[PDB]
């Protein structure tokens, strides 16, 4: 009914005609203000081949306000709080309304291969990312395999 | 699902199964490569221990012979003990035995100094020999693994 | 077993296959470590005895008057297990003969020591390089196979275009 609910509709159209590689996203058939997304981790990244579930919650302040996003699948990333919240720069303090769902999911995917220990949200992850890199890859691989459930 | 079609719920499960196989086949390859390193190291254990049995046999022989010439009782006892063919006593007393061989095997200060030097020569040789055996086994390992992996990769190449 | 067939299996079972393989793998590893510990033990033990023997051979060589005797000692001191076990009777006969109780020779031995020390260091280095090579190799080949499985994954092709 509202313009937020037809903008969301525009993002949904984008997710079909030019669905970006490695992601899916769809709002509940009843509630358009709530979306199931999922991301696949990229090749030559320690998150390769993962299948991470994501929840997006939208209010009537969209696209002026970015939605709340969290992974449902267990995660291990320096920019990932244990509740699934994310520390991405274009979500907090570099957000623009012209970013849609498709550009948000992919702006998150990039974080996998390119983490940001500069704004660390999970201490352990940013740590191993500099000390025991091999061991860090091990924990990320646990994450990936669990994501296939 | 057509590449130009929102990925469906069947599609996702399918992707995960092929990712699972990739992981399974990765741990399987890694496992059988371990199998090869293991079989190799068992073969090598067989072979070093057969050699070991045999040179220890010569050691027992050698120890008996020297015993027949010892002057002092501690010397006699060391030979008889070594002569039992215990595989440890000969490490623990390798120096003292070497010194006995150079003491009696032959027909002032210079003599004692040559004893020290020859003991040292034995120890260095020991080390050289350890390293030589380790390195031989390592090279064999490399060869075993190379032969293993290359065949799988070539089986994929014959898959065009 | 092959990638194309994975579609027919069940997901819940693929996890179990992964755990099957994980536990068996740790088992083989504990075995492998056992094996290696034994090989080093026996190889160090054998090293000691051969060292005692070839040191002896060279020691007694400075006494043997016959050129067959001198050749005997030299060949033994080349350090081969077989040739030692097989010429040990004659070796002992030699030892029976000559056991019945200057400067340049000591210089020879110090020369012997220096060259052997070099050899040891050479081999220690080469040992190290070989361990690294093994590591490198396993990583290299498995990366290659991982790529091969990614190149015949059709799910990958459709997910990524």
Short mmCIF file of C-alpha atoms in Angstrom, two decimals:
data_model
loop_
_atom_site.label_atom_id
_atom_site.label_comp_id
_atom_site.label_asym_id
_atom_site.label_seq_id
_atom_site.Cartn_x
_atom_site.Cartn_y
_atom_site.Cartn_z
CA UNK A 1 0.00 0.00 0.00
CA UNK A 2 2.61 2.56 1.10
CA UNK A 3 5.56 3.66 -1.07
CA UNK A 4 7.94 1.64 1.12
CA UNK A 5 5.96 -1.49 0.18
CA UNK A 6 6.27 -0.80 -3.57
CA UNK A 7 9.97 0.09 -3.31
CA UNK A 8 10.44 -3.29 -1.62
CA UNK A 9 8.54 -4.61 -4.62
CA UNK A 10 11.11 -2.97 -6.92
CA UNK A 11 13.96 -4.70 -5.05
CA UNK A 12 12.08 -8.01 -5.37
CA UNK A 13 11.85 -7.50 -9.14
CA UNK A 14 15.60 -6.91 -9.20
CA UNK A 15 16.10 -10.18 -7.30
CA UNK A 16 14.49 -12.07 -10.21
CA UNK A 17 15.35 -10.36 -13.48
CA UNK A 18 18.97 -9.80 -12.47
CA UNK A 19 19.40 -11.93 -9.33
CA UNK A 20 23.03 -11.41 -8.29
CA UNK A 21 25.26 -14.50 -8.22
CA UNK A 22 25.34 -16.50 -5.03
CA UNK A 23 22.40 -14.82 -3.31
CA UNK A 24 18.68 -15.37 -2.97
CA UNK A 25 16.13 -13.22 -1.18
CA UNK A 26 12.34 -13.21 -0.87
CA UNK A 27 9.84 -11.58 1.52
CA UNK A 28 7.22 -13.66 3.23
CA UNK A 29 4.27 -14.21 0.84
CA UNK A 30 2.06 -12.42 3.43
CA UNK A 31 4.52 -9.98 5.06
CA UNK A 32 6.54 -8.00 2.53
CA UNK A 33 8.30 -6.16 5.37
CA UNK A 34 10.22 -9.35 6.24
CA UNK A 35 12.68 -11.14 3.95
CA UNK A 36 14.46 -14.48 3.92
CA UNK A 37 17.83 -14.05 2.27
CA UNK A 38 20.79 -16.30 1.77
CA UNK A 39 24.39 -15.74 0.67
CA UNK A 40 26.94 -18.20 -0.80
CA UNK A 41 30.59 -17.73 0.11
CA UNK A 42 32.92 -17.02 -2.80
CA UNK A 43 35.67 -19.11 -4.36
CA UNK A 44 39.22 -18.72 -2.99
CA UNK A 45 37.73 -17.24 0.15
CA UNK A 46 37.83 -19.23 3.40
CA UNK A 47 34.03 -18.89 3.35
CA UNK A 48 33.91 -20.70 0.00
CA UNK A 49 30.78 -22.73 -0.79
CA UNK A 50 28.98 -21.77 2.45
CA UNK A 51 25.20 -21.28 2.50
CA UNK A 52 24.37 -18.65 5.12
CA UNK A 53 20.78 -17.76 5.99
CA UNK A 54 19.85 -14.17 6.69
CA UNK A 55 16.85 -12.36 8.09
CA UNK A 56 15.92 -8.80 7.12
CA UNK A 57 13.32 -6.78 9.03
CA UNK A 58 11.79 -3.70 7.31
CA UNK A 59 9.72 -0.77 8.65
CA UNK A 60 7.86 2.03 6.84
CA UNK A 61 11.02 4.19 6.85
CA UNK A 62 12.38 2.26 3.74
CA UNK A 63 14.39 3.00 1.61
CA UNK A 64 15.30 5.99 3.82
CA UNK A 65 16.23 3.62 6.68
CA UNK A 66 18.19 0.40 6.15
CA UNK A 67 16.58 -2.74 7.59
CA UNK A 68 17.86 -4.82 10.47
CA UNK A 69 19.95 -7.72 9.16
CA UNK A 70 21.35 -10.74 10.92
CA UNK A 71 22.62 -14.13 9.93
CA UNK A 72 20.62 -16.99 11.25
CA UNK A 73 23.30 -19.49 10.35
CA UNK A 74 26.15 -19.78 12.82
CA UNK A 75 28.86 -17.35 11.84
CA UNK A 76 32.56 -16.61 12.50
CA UNK A 77 33.54 -13.23 11.07
CA UNK A 78 35.35 -10.23 12.61
CA UNK A 79 32.43 -7.96 11.59
CA UNK A 80 29.77 -10.28 13.04
CA UNK A 81 28.38 -10.04 16.55
CA UNK A 82 27.28 -13.34 18.04
CA UNK A 83 23.61 -12.39 17.60
CA UNK A 84 24.15 -12.08 13.85
CA UNK A 85 24.39 -8.27 13.64
CA UNK A 86 26.92 -6.86 11.19
CA UNK A 87 29.48 -4.05 11.31
CA UNK A 88 29.38 -2.90 7.66
CA UNK A 89 30.16 0.70 6.81
CA UNK A 90 27.38 1.12 4.21
CA UNK A 91 24.80 -0.09 6.72
CA UNK A 92 25.53 2.28 9.63
CA UNK A 93 27.22 5.45 8.37
CA UNK A 94 27.48 5.13 4.58
CA UNK A 95 23.95 4.09 3.72
CA UNK A 96 22.03 5.61 0.80
CA UNK A 97 18.44 4.80 -0.20
CA UNK A 98 19.46 3.78 -3.71
CA UNK A 99 20.97 0.57 -2.26
CA UNK A 100 18.47 -2.26 -2.72
CA UNK A 101 18.33 -5.80 -1.29
CA UNK A 102 20.52 -7.12 -4.12
CA UNK A 103 23.24 -4.56 -3.48
CA UNK A 104 23.04 -5.09 0.28
CA UNK A 105 23.46 -8.88 0.15
CA UNK A 106 26.47 -8.51 -2.14
CA UNK A 107 27.98 -5.66 -0.10
CA UNK A 108 27.86 -8.23 2.73
CA UNK A 109 29.26 -11.12 0.62
CA UNK A 110 32.36 -8.98 -0.13
CA UNK A 111 33.07 -8.86 3.63
CA UNK A 112 33.81 -12.60 3.58
CA UNK A 113 36.87 -12.45 1.31
CA UNK A 114 37.63 -8.85 2.46
CA UNK A 115 37.02 -8.79 6.25
CA UNK A 116 37.53 -5.57 8.22
CA UNK A 117 39.41 -6.09 11.50
CA UNK A 118 39.40 -2.27 11.75
CA UNK A 119 35.86 -2.27 13.24
CA UNK A 120 35.93 -5.69 14.92
CA UNK A 121 32.60 -7.01 16.20
CA UNK A 122 33.77 -10.53 17.08
CA UNK A 123 37.03 -10.40 19.05
CA UNK A 124 38.16 -13.99 18.44
CA UNK A 125 37.68 -13.71 14.68
CA UNK A 126 39.75 -10.55 14.22
CA UNK A 127 42.40 -12.07 16.53
CA UNK A 128 43.05 -15.37 14.72
CA UNK A 129 42.83 -13.34 11.51
CA UNK A 130 46.22 -11.98 12.58
CA UNK A 131 47.78 -14.68 14.77
CA UNK A 132 46.87 -18.25 13.78
CA UNK A 133 45.64 -17.73 10.23
CA UNK A 134 45.52 -21.48 9.59
CA UNK A 135 43.48 -21.98 12.77
CA UNK A 136 41.19 -19.14 11.71
CA UNK A 137 40.54 -20.92 8.42
CA UNK A 138 39.70 -24.05 10.45
CA UNK A 139 37.01 -22.29 12.49
CA UNK A 140 35.55 -20.63 9.37
CA UNK A 141 35.36 -24.10 7.79
CA UNK A 142 33.37 -25.36 10.76
CA UNK A 143 31.03 -22.42 10.13
CA UNK A 144 30.70 -23.30 6.45
CA UNK A 145 29.92 -26.95 7.03
CA UNK A 146 27.31 -26.22 9.69
CA UNK A 147 25.71 -23.77 7.25
CA UNK A 148 24.76 -26.71 5.01
CA UNK A 149 22.20 -28.00 7.54
CA UNK B 1 16.35 -23.69 -12.51
CA UNK B 2 17.17 -21.50 -15.57
CA UNK B 3 20.22 -19.29 -14.75
CA UNK B 4 17.71 -16.44 -15.31
CA UNK B 5 15.33 -17.66 -12.53
CA UNK B 6 15.32 -16.75 -8.79
CA UNK B 7 17.10 -19.76 -7.28
CA UNK B 8 14.53 -22.18 -5.93
CA UNK B 9 14.40 -24.28 -2.78
CA UNK B 10 15.27 -27.42 -4.74
CA UNK B 11 18.23 -25.70 -6.38
CA UNK B 12 19.76 -24.77 -3.01
CA UNK B 13 19.62 -28.29 -1.62
CA UNK B 14 21.24 -29.49 -4.85
CA UNK B 15 24.09 -27.02 -4.53
CA UNK B 16 24.72 -28.13 -0.95
CA UNK B 17 24.87 -31.79 -1.96
CA UNK B 18 27.54 -31.13 -4.57
CA UNK B 19 29.42 -29.00 -2.00
CA UNK B 20 29.13 -31.92 0.41
CA UNK B 21 30.58 -34.33 -2.14
CA UNK B 22 33.40 -31.89 -2.84
CA UNK B 23 34.17 -31.90 0.87
CA UNK B 24 33.78 -35.65 1.17
CA UNK B 25 36.05 -36.36 -1.78
CA UNK B 26 38.55 -33.89 -0.35
CA UNK B 27 38.81 -35.67 2.98
CA UNK B 28 38.80 -39.01 1.13
CA UNK B 29 41.74 -38.05 -1.09
CA UNK B 30 43.52 -36.71 1.98
CA UNK B 31 42.81 -39.92 3.84
CA UNK B 32 44.10 -42.27 1.16
CA UNK B 33 47.21 -40.14 0.75
CA UNK B 34 47.68 -40.75 4.48
CA UNK B 35 47.08 -44.46 3.82
CA UNK B 36 49.99 -44.39 1.35
CA UNK B 37 52.36 -42.58 3.72
CA UNK B 38 51.39 -45.12 6.39
CA UNK B 39 51.90 -48.26 4.32
CA UNK B 40 55.25 -46.83 3.27
CA UNK B 41 56.32 -46.21 6.83
CA UNK B 42 55.34 -49.76 7.79
CA UNK B 43 57.46 -51.16 4.94
CA UNK B 44 60.32 -48.97 6.13
CA UNK B 45 59.92 -50.21 9.72
CA UNK B 46 60.09 -53.79 8.53
CA UNK B 47 63.27 -53.04 6.60
CA UNK B 48 65.17 -51.04 9.17
CA UNK B 49 64.36 -53.58 11.83
CA UNK B 50 65.60 -56.48 9.74
CA UNK B 51 68.86 -54.59 9.21
CA UNK B 52 68.89 -53.79 12.92
CA UNK B 53 68.47 -57.43 14.00
CA UNK B 54 71.43 -58.23 11.75
CA UNK B 55 73.99 -55.65 12.67
CA UNK B 56 73.13 -56.18 16.33
CA UNK B 57 73.97 -59.82 15.63
CA UNK B 58 77.40 -58.62 14.49
CA UNK B 59 77.60 -56.47 17.65
CA UNK B 60 76.95 -59.44 19.89
CA UNK B 61 79.66 -61.29 17.95
CA UNK B 62 82.02 -58.34 18.40
CA UNK B 63 81.23 -57.98 22.10
CA UNK B 64 81.89 -61.66 22.79
CA UNK B 65 85.29 -61.47 21.02
CA UNK B 66 86.50 -58.38 22.95
CA UNK B 67 85.39 -59.97 26.26
CA UNK B 68 88.10 -62.63 25.68
CA UNK B 69 90.79 -59.88 26.01
CA UNK B 70 89.45 -57.58 28.77
CA UNK B 71 91.79 -56.96 31.74
CA UNK B 72 89.38 -55.37 34.22
CA UNK B 73 86.10 -56.73 35.50
CA UNK B 74 83.97 -53.69 34.68
CA UNK B 75 85.14 -54.14 31.09
CA UNK B 76 84.26 -57.84 31.03
CA UNK B 77 80.82 -57.07 32.48
CA UNK B 78 80.14 -54.38 29.90
CA UNK B 79 81.00 -56.75 27.08
CA UNK B 80 78.89 -59.58 28.48
CA UNK B 81 75.97 -57.21 29.02
CA UNK B 82 76.28 -55.75 25.51
CA UNK B 83 76.74 -59.29 24.27
CA UNK B 84 73.29 -60.22 25.50
CA UNK B 85 71.96 -58.40 22.42
CA UNK B 86 69.87 -55.84 24.26
CA UNK B 87 69.05 -53.01 21.82
CA UNK B 88 69.21 -50.26 24.42
CA UNK B 89 72.29 -51.01 26.49
CA UNK B 90 74.32 -50.32 23.34
CA UNK B 91 73.00 -46.78 22.97
CA UNK B 92 73.48 -46.05 26.68
CA UNK B 93 77.10 -47.29 26.61
CA UNK B 94 78.02 -46.72 22.97
CA UNK B 95 80.93 -44.47 23.95
CA UNK B 96 82.40 -46.88 26.49
CA UNK B 97 82.16 -49.72 24.00
CA UNK B 98 83.79 -47.77 21.21
CA UNK B 99 86.62 -47.00 23.62
CA UNK B 100 86.99 -50.72 24.33
CA UNK B 101 87.24 -51.55 20.64
CA UNK B 102 89.96 -48.98 20.14
CA UNK B 103 91.57 -50.14 23.38
CA UNK B 104 91.94 -53.86 22.58
CA UNK B 105 91.23 -54.20 18.83
CA UNK B 106 94.69 -52.68 18.20
CA UNK B 107 97.95 -54.71 18.59
CA UNK B 108 101.49 -42.43 26.11
CA UNK B 109 99.30 -39.34 25.56
CA UNK B 110 98.82 -39.73 21.80
CA UNK B 111 97.02 -43.07 22.27
CA UNK B 112 94.45 -41.63 24.68
CA UNK B 113 93.92 -38.62 22.43
CA UNK B 114 93.20 -40.87 19.41
CA UNK B 115 90.68 -42.70 21.62
CA UNK B 116 88.84 -39.41 22.24
CA UNK B 117 88.98 -38.49 18.57
CA UNK B 118 87.63 -41.85 17.38
CA UNK B 119 84.79 -41.73 19.89
CA UNK B 120 83.90 -38.30 18.46
CA UNK B 121 84.12 -39.68 14.94
CA UNK B 122 81.65 -42.42 15.91
CA UNK B 123 79.17 -39.91 17.40
CA UNK B 124 79.33 -37.64 14.30
CA UNK B 125 78.89 -40.67 12.05
CA UNK B 126 75.92 -41.73 14.19
CA UNK B 127 74.34 -38.30 13.53
CA UNK B 128 75.20 -38.43 9.85
CA UNK B 129 73.56 -41.88 9.71
CA UNK B 130 70.41 -40.86 11.55
CA UNK B 131 70.07 -37.93 9.13
CA UNK B 132 70.82 -40.15 6.14
CA UNK B 133 68.10 -42.63 7.15
CA UNK B 134 65.56 -39.87 7.92
CA UNK B 135 66.24 -38.20 4.59
CA UNK B 136 65.95 -41.47 2.62
CA UNK B 137 62.54 -42.16 4.22
CA UNK B 138 61.41 -38.55 3.55
CA UNK B 139 62.40 -38.78 -0.15
CA UNK B 140 60.50 -42.08 -0.37
CA UNK B 141 57.50 -40.34 1.21
CA UNK B 142 57.66 -37.54 -1.36
CA UNK B 143 57.80 -40.10 -4.14
CA UNK B 144 54.88 -42.10 -2.77
CA UNK B 145 52.67 -39.02 -2.46
CA UNK B 146 53.61 -37.68 -5.89
CA UNK B 147 52.71 -40.99 -7.48
CA UNK B 148 49.42 -40.99 -5.58
CA UNK B 149 48.18 -37.51 -6.37
CA UNK B 150 49.34 -37.47 -10.00
CA UNK B 151 47.24 -40.54 -10.80
CA UNK B 152 44.04 -39.00 -9.49
CA UNK B 153 44.73 -35.79 -11.38
CA UNK B 154 45.45 -37.80 -14.54
CA UNK B 155 42.22 -39.76 -14.01
CA UNK B 156 40.48 -36.38 -14.17
CA UNK B 157 42.41 -35.49 -17.36
CA UNK B 158 41.29 -38.77 -19.00
CA UNK B 159 37.82 -37.43 -18.01
CA UNK B 160 38.56 -34.68 -20.59
CA UNK C 1 31.44 -41.75 -4.66
CA UNK C 2 31.57 -39.64 -7.85
CA UNK C 3 30.31 -36.02 -7.91
CA UNK C 4 27.46 -36.56 -10.44
CA UNK C 5 25.93 -39.25 -8.17
CA UNK C 6 25.82 -37.07 -5.04
CA UNK C 7 22.34 -35.90 -6.12
CA UNK C 8 20.89 -39.34 -5.34
CA UNK C 9 22.22 -39.60 -1.77
CA UNK C 10 20.55 -37.96 1.26
CA UNK C 11 21.96 -34.90 3.05
CA UNK C 12 21.65 -36.39 6.54
CA UNK C 13 23.76 -39.32 5.37
CA UNK C 14 26.43 -37.13 3.75
CA UNK C 15 27.09 -35.60 7.13
CA UNK C 16 27.47 -39.08 8.59
CA UNK C 17 29.87 -40.02 5.83
CA UNK C 18 31.89 -36.96 6.78
CA UNK C 19 32.05 -38.04 10.41
CA UNK C 20 32.83 -41.62 9.39
CA UNK C 21 35.79 -40.26 7.44
CA UNK C 22 36.85 -37.83 10.16
CA UNK C 23 37.10 -40.48 12.91
CA UNK C 24 38.80 -43.09 10.67
CA UNK C 25 41.25 -40.34 9.62
CA UNK C 26 42.24 -39.51 13.23
CA UNK C 27 42.64 -43.27 13.79
CA UNK C 28 45.04 -43.66 10.83
CA UNK C 29 46.90 -40.52 12.03
CA UNK C 30 47.44 -41.95 15.53
CA UNK C 31 48.65 -45.12 13.76
CA UNK C 32 50.95 -43.14 11.46
CA UNK C 33 52.48 -41.29 14.38
CA UNK C 34 53.07 -44.62 16.15
CA UNK C 35 54.74 -46.03 13.02
CA UNK C 36 57.02 -43.03 12.56
CA UNK C 37 58.07 -43.02 16.20
CA UNK C 38 59.13 -46.65 15.79
CA UNK C 39 61.00 -46.02 12.50
CA UNK C 40 63.04 -43.16 14.03
CA UNK C 41 63.79 -45.26 17.15
CA UNK C 42 65.04 -48.24 15.16
CA UNK C 43 66.83 -45.97 12.68
CA UNK C 44 68.69 -44.15 15.41
CA UNK C 45 69.56 -47.51 17.02
CA UNK C 46 70.85 -48.95 13.73
CA UNK C 47 72.72 -45.71 13.05
CA UNK C 48 74.60 -46.11 16.38
CA UNK C 49 75.70 -49.72 15.69
CA UNK C 50 76.76 -49.03 12.06
CA UNK C 51 78.71 -46.02 13.37
CA UNK C 52 80.43 -48.18 15.94
CA UNK C 53 81.32 -50.65 13.19
CA UNK C 54 82.49 -48.30 10.47
CA UNK C 55 84.48 -46.34 13.02
CA UNK C 56 86.04 -49.68 13.93
CA UNK C 57 86.75 -50.66 10.34
CA UNK C 58 88.55 -47.37 9.70
CA UNK C 59 90.41 -47.69 12.99
CA UNK C 60 91.79 -51.13 12.29
CA UNK C 61 92.55 -50.20 8.64
CA UNK C 62 95.57 -48.20 9.91
CA UNK C 63 97.02 -51.60 10.94
CA UNK C 64 96.09 -54.18 8.27
CA UNK C 65 99.30 -54.83 6.24
CA UNK C 66 97.65 -56.75 3.41
CA UNK C 67 95.96 -54.88 0.54
CA UNK C 68 93.02 -57.30 0.73
CA UNK C 69 92.74 -56.39 4.40
CA UNK C 70 92.90 -52.69 3.65
CA UNK C 71 90.29 -53.12 0.91
CA UNK C 72 88.13 -55.08 3.32
CA UNK C 73 88.10 -52.29 5.89
CA UNK C 74 87.47 -49.62 3.26
CA UNK C 75 84.50 -51.43 1.75
CA UNK C 76 82.97 -52.09 5.13
CA UNK C 77 83.42 -48.47 6.12
CA UNK C 78 81.37 -47.46 3.08
CA UNK C 79 78.54 -48.38 5.48
CA UNK C 80 76.18 -50.71 3.58
CA UNK C 81 74.12 -53.11 5.75
CA UNK C 82 74.19 -56.00 3.29
CA UNK C 83 77.88 -55.86 2.45
CA UNK C 84 78.64 -55.61 6.13
CA UNK C 85 76.54 -58.59 7.20
CA UNK C 86 77.97 -60.57 4.32
CA UNK C 87 81.62 -59.85 4.94
CA UNK C 88 81.48 -59.97 8.69
CA UNK C 89 83.14 -63.39 9.08
CA UNK C 90 86.29 -62.27 7.24
CA UNK C 91 86.06 -58.96 9.12
CA UNK C 92 86.13 -60.87 12.42
CA UNK C 93 88.98 -63.07 11.18
CA UNK C 94 90.90 -59.84 10.57
CA UNK C 95 90.11 -58.57 14.05
CA UNK C 96 91.40 -61.84 15.58
CA UNK C 97 94.69 -61.36 13.72
CA UNK C 98 95.70 -57.88 14.84
CA UNK C 99 94.36 -57.60 18.40
CA UNK C 100 97.06 -58.77 20.85
CA UNK C 101 97.85 -56.26 23.63
CA UNK C 102 101.96 -40.16 15.08
CA UNK C 103 101.19 -36.48 14.41
CA UNK C 104 100.15 -36.72 10.74
CA UNK C 105 97.58 -39.41 11.57
CA UNK C 106 95.88 -37.17 14.15
CA UNK C 107 95.70 -34.41 11.57
CA UNK C 108 94.03 -36.90 9.26
CA UNK C 109 91.42 -37.64 11.94
CA UNK C 110 90.70 -33.97 12.54
CA UNK C 111 90.23 -33.67 8.79
CA UNK C 112 87.87 -36.65 8.97
CA UNK C 113 85.95 -34.91 11.78
CA UNK C 114 85.61 -31.57 9.89
CA UNK C 115 84.35 -33.16 6.64
CA UNK C 116 81.86 -35.33 8.59
CA UNK C 117 80.59 -32.26 10.51
CA UNK C 118 80.05 -30.50 7.16
CA UNK C 119 78.17 -33.57 5.82
CA UNK C 120 75.98 -33.65 8.92
CA UNK C 121 75.05 -29.97 8.51
CA UNK C 122 74.45 -30.48 4.80
CA UNK C 123 72.07 -33.38 5.50
CA UNK C 124 70.30 -31.55 8.30
CA UNK C 125 69.56 -28.73 5.91
CA UNK C 126 68.37 -31.14 3.23
CA UNK C 127 66.13 -32.91 5.78
CA UNK C 128 64.50 -29.62 6.58
CA UNK C 129 63.97 -28.73 2.90
CA UNK C 130 62.34 -32.13 2.35
CA UNK C 131 59.84 -31.67 5.15
CA UNK C 132 58.86 -28.34 3.59
CA UNK C 133 58.61 -29.96 0.17
CA UNK C 134 56.20 -32.58 1.52
CA UNK C 135 54.02 -29.87 2.97
CA UNK C 136 54.09 -27.78 -0.22
CA UNK C 137 53.30 -30.84 -2.32
CA UNK C 138 50.28 -32.05 -0.42
CA UNK C 139 48.82 -28.52 -0.46
CA UNK C 140 49.62 -28.15 -4.18
CA UNK C 141 48.05 -31.35 -5.38
CA UNK C 142 44.92 -31.12 -3.25
CA UNK C 143 44.35 -27.55 -4.43
CA UNK C 144 44.48 -28.89 -7.97
CA UNK C 145 41.92 -31.61 -7.31
CA UNK C 146 39.64 -29.18 -5.49
CA UNK C 147 39.66 -27.08 -8.64
CA UNK C 148 38.84 -30.13 -10.76
CA UNK C 149 35.77 -30.87 -8.64
CA UNK C 150 34.74 -27.25 -8.91
CA UNK C 151 35.01 -27.46 -12.70
CA UNK C 152 32.52 -30.32 -13.04
CA UNK C 153 30.12 -29.00 -10.41
CA UNK C 154 27.09 -27.87 -12.37
CA UNK C 155 25.44 -26.43 -9.26
CA UNK C 156 28.41 -24.07 -9.08
CA UNK C 157 27.93 -23.13 -12.72
CA UNK C 158 24.25 -22.23 -12.26
CA UNK C 159 24.72 -20.46 -8.94
CA UNK C 160 27.49 -18.34 -10.41
CA UNK C 161 26.78 -18.24 -14.25
#
